[PDB]
Amino acid sequence: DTKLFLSLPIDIRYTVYFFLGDIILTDRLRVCLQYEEQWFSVQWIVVSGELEIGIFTTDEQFLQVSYTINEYCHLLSIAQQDLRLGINVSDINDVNELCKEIQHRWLFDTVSYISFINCWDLDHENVVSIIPCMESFNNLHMLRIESKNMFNNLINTQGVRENPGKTIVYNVRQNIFELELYTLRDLGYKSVVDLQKWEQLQCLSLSGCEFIDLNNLILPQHCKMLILKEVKYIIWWDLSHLLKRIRPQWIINGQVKKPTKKEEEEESEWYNLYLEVVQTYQPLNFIELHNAKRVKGNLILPARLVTESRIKISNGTKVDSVLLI
Amino acid sequence: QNVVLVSVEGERFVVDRKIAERSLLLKNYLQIVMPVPNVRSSVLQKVIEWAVHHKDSNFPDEDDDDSRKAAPVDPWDREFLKVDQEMLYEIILAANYLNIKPLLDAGCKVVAEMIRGRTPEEIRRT
Amino acid sequence: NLYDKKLFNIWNQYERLWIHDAFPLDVSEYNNTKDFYGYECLFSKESIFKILDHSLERLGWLYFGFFTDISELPYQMERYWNEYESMNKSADQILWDLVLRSVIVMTIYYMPAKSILSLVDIDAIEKYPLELKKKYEIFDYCLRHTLNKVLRTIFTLPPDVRTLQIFLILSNTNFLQIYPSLGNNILVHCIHLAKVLGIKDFKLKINDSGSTRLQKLSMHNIWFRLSTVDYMRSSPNKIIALHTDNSSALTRKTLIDSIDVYDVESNLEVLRWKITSLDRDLEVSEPSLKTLKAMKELLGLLDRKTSVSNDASFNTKFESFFLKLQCNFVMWKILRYEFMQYGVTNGLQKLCCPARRIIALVANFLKEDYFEYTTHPFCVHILCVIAGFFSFYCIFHEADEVRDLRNDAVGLLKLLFDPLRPVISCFFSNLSRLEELRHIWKSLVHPVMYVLKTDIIKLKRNLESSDFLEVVREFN
Amino acid sequence: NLYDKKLFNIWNQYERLWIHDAFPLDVSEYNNTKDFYGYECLFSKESIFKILDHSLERLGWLYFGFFTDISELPYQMERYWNEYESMNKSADQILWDLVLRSVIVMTIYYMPAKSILSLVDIDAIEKYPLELKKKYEIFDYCLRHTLNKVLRTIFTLPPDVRTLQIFLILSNTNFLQIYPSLGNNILVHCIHLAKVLGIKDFKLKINDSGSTRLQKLSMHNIWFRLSTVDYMRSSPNKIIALHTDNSNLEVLRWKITSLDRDLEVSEPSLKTLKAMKELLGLLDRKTSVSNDASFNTKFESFFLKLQCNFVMWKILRYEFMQYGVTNGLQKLCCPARRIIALVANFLKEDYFEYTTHPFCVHILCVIAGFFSFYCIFHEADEVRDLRNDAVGLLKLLFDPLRPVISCFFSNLSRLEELRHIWKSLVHPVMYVLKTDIIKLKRNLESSDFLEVVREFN
Questions:
Q1: How many pairs of residues across C and D have Cβ atoms under 8 Å apart?
Q2: GO annotations under biological process (chain B) (predicted)?
């Protein structure tokens, strides 16, 4: 029933709605907003020249409903409730420009997230519209990308160009602490992955691909939070010379240590080895995996981090060469 | 080994130790009688009924949310939970009180099944 | 419920203002002060070596964490005594003198009474100003002499690391809770010395020496202890601080000199700072609920890692006691925040369990004849806030559970504690005023909550039948 | 010419490390050292009131700027004297005592020798340890006694504003360039007191009374002077600061200092420099609005014009160094001549004592540095003549800052020998300057014959 459901605390209803990933719905969106809106992607839209706020799936953003600002703001407390946006074949340029000018004129520009679900061409007016328009769009830190062609033709900065309105202003590249990306086959196969211009980043998200190597990946400072979701086999760092460094003088149970202060040869070697090991993973402190089903590259890790929940694998357990320091 | 548990009405029910050490609150509270405030007799009786049906069974983790939502609703549990809403909510409440998660998750699963398998006449009542 | 949430917020400010609660202003009073240290003076070198032996036996933790090598200390001591004998200056010798003086004083504070009383000489009691009252009095006389010496030699000196050690050696004492403005100023000076010497460069490098490793380790221990106190003693009388230069261990989603953690080391000072950062992110920064779920997971994990440590000797008991105490305290604060602001179910009883845990712990550490170990002031601050909240929600709401817990804590703390006389006396007296407020409220924009609104207004302005209600306001 | 720009950047680092260049250990050698104030002790109160008259006449500037009311000072003085005469404590009385002592010591620093030498008692000279040398020795003994008194009493007292007044009253002295680390720590404590008291709340609000306005004015001037010193005295021995919370002509002094900061620390542009220079010309207009009618006014306007032309010299230097416009050597030399005309005016008027403020000395140090540099690397008799005037002036005139100028002078004479070297391309001379900065950095924690002459020096 309804009020009997609503006479209850928040955690029970949270787990219920988690399983179910309308007053039902109003409490649903209260608590989903309260904790985390990983479930429902929620952004602005216009139909008939009339603005509304539509609420979507996350993967490809099929709509469910939309509702009015004043309805939603009587439902809740009005504010600069920070929010999202995503451009499609539905949402390109004039609706994008209309929302821009109306958020300037009638309203203010409260929205953060931007999404590139469609428009892999870098073309047909969406990029053309939006690249001038980011200046009055200032709460953000957060972005979604789809295609490797777009990533190669926009993001991977080896392909430097001189197309100023075609690409971002770089003051925005400062103000993008988070990132999201999906939807390609072979990122790192002989690739040019290098992102030092992408500065003041602090969190990355990846999902849904078929291949990766991490030796190809070179990165800025300040970014350590890595989220990675269900993919195919991975080429981890090789560490084969560093495997060759090792002796079985010390090896126990998947861990190693020198207790002997006197053995400055092996003690110094141990610390050299540990510091090489973190130097491989130097700008990184946190990894999340959903089931990716294979990793190839002779894993040897630190024990500080796996004793905590930093190295957070699901059971993509097709690997044996695991070890700790 | 066995331990006593007081239904707050006053009923000093008894369970085997380790079959209750399945629980987490109890496993910490010990680490023989224990109170159980705001819990009734048949409530705890059916709780222990599930607890004893599900002793040797595997339960994945409190983090594997995909396998969690990988949802085999157990038929024994499913028929066992063919009860009213209020007793059911009380079961769920005491499950939250005890940190015994799979029973709790199954209760939420079936309430989700109720409010999924719905009619618009449920809404036209509203 | 919403009234409840509001008065809980008011309790938050009221505990801040509770807790932000003689020295002669002029050093020349202590110009001609004798000693406690000389050969004929008070404390008899042979005994002093025993005091240091007691210190290494029991209380290695502190200075074992700081220094590199520790046979250094008796070595330096014997050198000092030989030189003082030959004399019947420099920087190094004066520094080490102050170090040994401070180390001694810490050891005095964590000694038992009868031992020191047997140790001390006799006739100098007749010379000097004069049970535990003798202990804490002679301790105070020692401290003020030390502080004369150290203030002078603090300022008129180069910057050396050893000064920091002195303050960190002294901070685990009544000092900062008896001489707080002084402690804040000298803390500011020590912060300046910290950022001078680049002790953020514990960031370990390739193919350094074991000595170099130990040096960087010492810096690391120093850094995190200092971040601990700089958080913990951050009343609005101070505004400068260093705890921002570290980073939260929380792994937020919503967001160079700024250190990150998890990239360094795992020595338990790390763990203490992690716990304190969780307290920080609770108090001053964005309260969420998913955040608290993650914090609670992480902290249960860390208590597991704590209890993995095993019983072998007094120091180890002491350390793991202190950490588990911290962890249950922080869990209590989290669950307070939950049950107050959002009121999820069962949290009151689940909150009551850690408190029972703490009280069992301190009762155990009494029963083992380690009452002296109890007197670390952090424990006292913990019991202070516990008694505060328990009094509050006892007078507003009924539970013989809560009454029993509060009665245990207050009878404990009342019957036992000499040293912290001003703080405890102020606390007990205003607590008794709140008990009178119980009788009042037993006798909803209530006048009682209005009275507490008046009290916070009184305190904020102190930084720089309503007739009868005002009358009892006058009465208390 | 590109080589000139690179060597100019090397010279930037070398002047930085120039400017980043006995008192006991236990405050107990001075436990019983004699006073210089009592009735029979040295200085004879009636004379002290004349010293104060000289101070208020000539040097209102500082403490007219700071306090609320200044008749309070003779008032408090005579109150202490009455109390002293009755006595033959508290916080207030000790601070006001320390205030007047510091005031006096500043006045000693800006007095002529003959008058003070006539004022001092004779047999108390015979009691005590012993021209300008006598003057600066008695000044040092005054300073150190005062420092003894203040060091004890600083830590043990609540945060009150008057401590700040003490430190800023004493900053205009040799003090902070002879006992620098000491000065940095006491500065840090004063910074702590500043952020305590909320003296960034000089934002003057509506319906504030006159007393509140004067309080905020005092607060306003103090905070900005404090930020001024905190930028100017910001070597690596201190790192905590209040010259970042930024972005009546005390404001103007801070503006000028912030322009110097933006020059030294951050973005080299040219439109920025053009606007800055224009703004400084606007402030020179506002500067010369101040008409001359009294000694303190001449002193103030002297120091302001000095600051303005100094910063213009730095800006125009930075342009000519970074981007190399033509005629800038002459356009840089002219401000220096302007500075020298000012100090010439203040010598000729028998106001030499006012010249002795250390900021002027720091200015001439950096000027003589760069002039010697570009004289050895390039030829212009104008720059040689100005440099010769500066060093002859500075040697002939400056006794209190004896070690630093002498160290600089000795190394300056060493640099004159480097002229002969260069006079005798990754040149060896620029490689020698690379070696020299490396020596300094490692101190901070025919190349055979070139190293041989280096070994000679």
A1: 93
A2: protein ubiquitination; ubiquitin-dependent protein catabolic process
